[PDB]
Design a protein around this ligand. Structure first.
Ligand SMILES: Cn1cc(Nc2ncc(C3CN(c4nc5ccc(OCCC(C)(C)O)cc5o4)C3)nc2C(N)=O)cn1
Ligand SMILES: [Cl-]
Ligand SMILES: [Cl-]
Ligand SMILES: [Cl-]
Ligand SMILES: [Cl-]
Length: 277
């Protein structure tokens, strides 16, 4: 296979460890020196040219923002199967972290200002992706990672789409996306815009504010489109600042043109956080 951007890492340099999630695995990557590096490995019927997976991975390897995960490379192993090499993040995903915090043994009770800072981190990463014409298409707390220094990075770009680029071979997976994070207009035919990500960002904010609750208690996935069509939205979480709830609600306006951009959301959240004692 041709790799013009040199994103492929030799398969012999990678040693696969335990399963982190389901798939994501732990791994050890031998560097130029005798040293080993702890990494994570993501592995994902009519398929596109593998050269395009490598080109997309090479483009993401050039992402440089503290709130966006940075791909290390791709390892190919045999029918070639690509595996994405990522920095190892021992704290894991934000969604599980929020649930663990509601246990005596988990992280301490998360202060309201730490919850807000997690949202600022995500809006900063999304502003960076949005400005580069990337649609995440799977934004949720389970797809945000906690760095060792407790800053959040947006991650899991496996089903993302650069605006105007080809997307035929992702359609089958896009059709299976969890319905409770999808914008009302994107539910009918699974067609996404930057405003679809803004809707998902509002849902993600609500997940952070509720400390990991599943969106829309009492509403089943099959009832979701009709529920939103009737104008119903996620309810204000207990102790959620009214100002914060209004920022979340602006992400779910029926007309996508009425929702704010990530730059506006980000500034609104930074100002709200600064105003707190
Ligand atoms: C229990 N536990 C779990 C951990 N750590 C983890 N758990 C889950 C993840 C997910 C898997 N990640 C992920 N971000 C990605 C971005 C891009 C990508 O492909 C782009 C190329 C192309 C478009 C062509 O597909 C694939 C990606 O996969 C976040 N990561 C870790 C970690 N990094 O350590 C600790 N404890
Ligand atoms: Cl992914
Ligand atoms: Cl296409
Ligand atoms: Cl789309
Ligand atoms: Cl709700």
């Amino acid at each position: 296979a041709m790799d013009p951007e040199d994103v492929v890492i030799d398969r012999n340099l990678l040693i696969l460890g335990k399963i982190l999630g389901e798939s994501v695995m732990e791994g050890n990557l031998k560097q130029e020196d005798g040293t080993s590096l702890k990494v994570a490995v993501k592995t994902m019927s009519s398929q596109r040219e593998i050269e395009e997976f490598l080109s997309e991975a090479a483009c993401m390897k050039d992402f440089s923002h503290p709130n966006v995960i940075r791909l290390l490379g791709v390892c190919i192993e045999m029918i070639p199967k690509p595996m994405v090499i990522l920095p190892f993040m021992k704290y894991g995903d934000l969604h599980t972290y929020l649930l663990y915090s509601r246990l005596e043994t988990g992280p301490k009770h998360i202060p309201l200002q730490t919850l807000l800072k997690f949202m600022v981190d995500i809006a900063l990463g999304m502003e960076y992706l949005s400005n580069r014409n990337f649609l995440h298409r799977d934004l949720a707390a389970r797809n945000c990672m906690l760095r060792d220094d407790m800053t959040v990075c947006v991650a899991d770009f496996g089903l993302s789409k650069k605006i105007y680029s080809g997307d035929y071979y992702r359609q089958g997976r896009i059709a299976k996306m969890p319905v409770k994070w999808i914008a009302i207009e994107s539910l009918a035919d699974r067609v996404y815009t930057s405003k679809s990500d803004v809707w998902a960002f509002g849902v993600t904010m609500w997940e952070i504010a509720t400390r990991g609750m599943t969106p829309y208690p009492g509403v089943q996935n099959h009832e979701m489109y009709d529920y939103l069509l009737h104008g119903h939205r996620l309810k204000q979480p207990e102790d959620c600042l009214d100002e914060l709830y209004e920022i979340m609600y602006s992400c779910w306006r029926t007309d996508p043109l009425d929702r704010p951009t990530f730059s506006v959301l980000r500034l609104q959240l930074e100002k709200l956080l600064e105003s707190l004692p």
